[PDB]
């Protein structure tokens, strides 16, 4: 056999160096498939560490402006009576109807957020959905 030192390098490195030194008299199969078709990252062993000090994570938060529209929609109406069906791909709920109407009303150019909100309520009443605002 060969090596069982997983911490020396990647498995391709040790197998390459070992067959190239020629103690191994038979080249393995996955070696030819490995140097034929390589992976993106060499899988070399790393001890993990711990963030100390002012280091933080470089994974961002995911927001949109429609999330801010949903914020005031949820602060007023809560969840609408339409229960979510998360198997439905195009489930356009009252949040989604509210925000789509809000975007095509921001396409009018009313800077005032309250008349946008209220004309959005009127466009949903013109669609036919009863608004359950906690008055």
């Amino acid at each position: 056999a060969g090596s069982r030192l997983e911490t020396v390098g990647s498995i391709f490195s040790r197998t390459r160096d070992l067959v190239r030194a020629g103690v191994l008299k038979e080249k393995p199969l996955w070696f030819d498939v490995y140097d034929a078709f390589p992976p993106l990252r060499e899988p070399v062993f790393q001890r993990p560490r711990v963030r100390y000090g002012k280091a933080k994570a470089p994974i961002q938060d995911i927001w949109y402006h429609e999330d801010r529209i949903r914020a005031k929609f949820y602060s007023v109406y809560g969840s609408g009576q339409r229960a979510f069906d998360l198997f439905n791909p195009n489930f356009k709920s009252t949040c989604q109807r509210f925000v789509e109407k809000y975007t095509e009303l921001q396409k009018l150019g009313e800077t005032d957020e309250e008349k946008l909100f209220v004309e959005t309520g009127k466009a949903l009443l013109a669609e036919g959905v009863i608004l359950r605002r906690v008055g």
Binding site: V50, Y64, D67, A83, F84, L86, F91, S93, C95, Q96
Partner: protein
């Protein structure tokens, strides 16, 4: 034409925002003797119990109604470097449809 950011900008999980008390429908895929497992979408499932009302009506394949408490329910404890999960979400049951 259809990118990756396009698939999850208007995806329903981004559409509904935070899962604090929202109505959701979910189905049954496994039952053990007292308990029914409610696969409502997202990563995990939630388990609940048969209420006496509509007792054998809650069967394998029926839809129910969920109140949607938080989706994973993890918390780091006193001396642990990482929080442990439960692989559950554990919302509150209402009824059917």
């Amino acid at each position: 034409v259809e990118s990756f950011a396009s698939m999850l900008r208007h995806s329903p999980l981004t559409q509904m925002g935070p899962a604090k008390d929202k109505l959701v429908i979910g189905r049954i895929f496994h039952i053990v003797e007292n308990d029914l497992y409610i696969d409502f979408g997202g990563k995990f499932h939630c388990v609940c119990r048969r209420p006496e009302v509509d007792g054998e009506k809650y069967q394998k394949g029926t839809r129910v109604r969920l109140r949607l408490l938080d989706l994973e329910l993890t918390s780091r404890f006193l001396g642990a470097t990482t929080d442990t999960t439960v692989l559950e979400a554990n919302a509150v049951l209402l009824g059917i449809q």
